[PDB]
Amino acid sequence: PAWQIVLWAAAYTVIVVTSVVGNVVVMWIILAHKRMRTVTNYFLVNLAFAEASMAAFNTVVNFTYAVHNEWYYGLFYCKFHNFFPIAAVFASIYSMTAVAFDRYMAIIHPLQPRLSATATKVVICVIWVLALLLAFPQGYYSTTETMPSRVVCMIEWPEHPNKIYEKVYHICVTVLIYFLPLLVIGYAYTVVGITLWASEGIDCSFWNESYLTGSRDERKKSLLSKFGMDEGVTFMFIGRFDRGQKGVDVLLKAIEILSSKKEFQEMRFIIIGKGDPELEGWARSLEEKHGNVKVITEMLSREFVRELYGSVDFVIIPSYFEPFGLVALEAMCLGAIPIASAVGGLRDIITNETGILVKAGDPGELANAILKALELSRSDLSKFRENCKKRAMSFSEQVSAKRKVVKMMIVVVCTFAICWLPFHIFFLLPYINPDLYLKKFIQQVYLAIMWLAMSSTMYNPIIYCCLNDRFRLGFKHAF
Length: 479
Ligand SMILES: C[C@@H](O[C@H]1OCCN(Cc2nn[nH]c2CN(C)C)[C@H]1c1ccc(F)cc1)c1cc(C(F)(F)F)cc(C(F)(F)F)c1
Hints:
Layout: H1 5-32, H2 39-65, H3 77-108, H4 117-139, E1 143-146, E2 151-154, H5 162-197, H6 216-226, E3 233-238, H7 248-259, E4 267-272, H8 277-289, E5 293-296, H9 302-309, E6 314-317, H10 326-333, E7 337-341, H11 344-349, E8 356-358, H12 363-376, H13 382-419, H14 421-428, H15 443-455, H16 460-467, H17 469-477
Parallel strand pairs: 3-4, 3-6, 4-5, 6-7, 7-8
Antiparallel strand pairs: 1-2
The structure holds ligand L76.
Cytoplasmic side: 28-37, 102-121, 193-407
Subunit structure: Interacts with ARRB1.
Membrane topology: Multi-pass membrane protein
């Protein structure tokens, strides 16, 4: 194959160059910047080290030697070249595994920051030793066996049939360096993905006080007038009427508590929702009975709900189960002060200076919180509402960042998942299924696959600057 010569020279050349340049600069960016030294990035340093700085430079040249059995330098490089890719890739993927579980803990169990700076260094050291210890039984025992034309090296022990032994060692390193750790990360990012991406999020353009006219006080005067009410402290509920999930039953209980008290004359309620006919009845029952209570069962314009949020003083969110708390956000963006049950996404979102938090299912604490809110309405709540808006927007952006980060890590894991699949199944095939040498395509495919698997090493540094801006601007600094 004369035509195909310089083709696969350029093929490997781009790999080594892009791989090494990319990864060495990654390590430089992480260490040079004032604090990028987070444990995730530390494992990414070890990744960059094992994956490209070492693997590309040792492997490519040697497999290029090994195409026609040229063996320019055989020396000890046979056993090194045989030993090293196993260690380097082990160290790489388990650095990437390390990150997958750093994010697992940070997101799922944020209360225990398990990994210190020291511990992180220990991990990197441990991984390397286990990587070389997995590799040595095959690496150390590579023997060059001299023939008339060529000198070529391999690793075997024939005491029992080659299948029995070979199959075992082969499948062990294959499953340990590829299949199992990919299963583990797959799990970790599946559940972290579920956590971050379960919620679509809210339109921060749509829910903004900007689209409303006049003062909030005028808007409340107007809104209550439309319901035939005099001005007072206004509370609002929006959600499905149900026993199990949302807590309209508890609001109704709390309203009936308050009805027997004098301060109830200074309150205004707006209950919005559809569901359990009994709870619609209960709500409408109190509507007729008292008349500082208004119930809406009809479907409402998104714009009208924004008006409500941006007019009422407080929003009640007495959930049992609320994994997202999108109501809190929409309310807080529009300056409604949330009086929420502490559950799921509501304890995450609401701070001490942000809203009032109460125990779910307790009409006692809820009725009191409503009365607290009444006493608070006698002061200036404006700064309270400012806090809510800032918090709601802050929370939103935190989540966006966390998502963008974990995305990037999934991408780099999906890379290895791709490139190295053909490489392993290629070596795994001639066992249960005897090799087909029937086609004229033999060496060329080995080259193409090996090229892909080796090209995995030059992908990550590109993926880093393409997803994450911090790396990209780190590139902007020098190149
Ligand atoms: C695709 C995968 O091959 C290895 O596992 C499958 C069997 N491969 C052939 C092999 N080598 N020694 N013993 C055997 C099995 N025996 C029956 C011939 C493995 C392998 C291939 C090339 C090596 F340098 C080291 C290991 C693999 C290759 C490479 C490398 F070629 F790039 F070096 C590296 C790795 C690893 F990720 F482990 F580093 C795996």
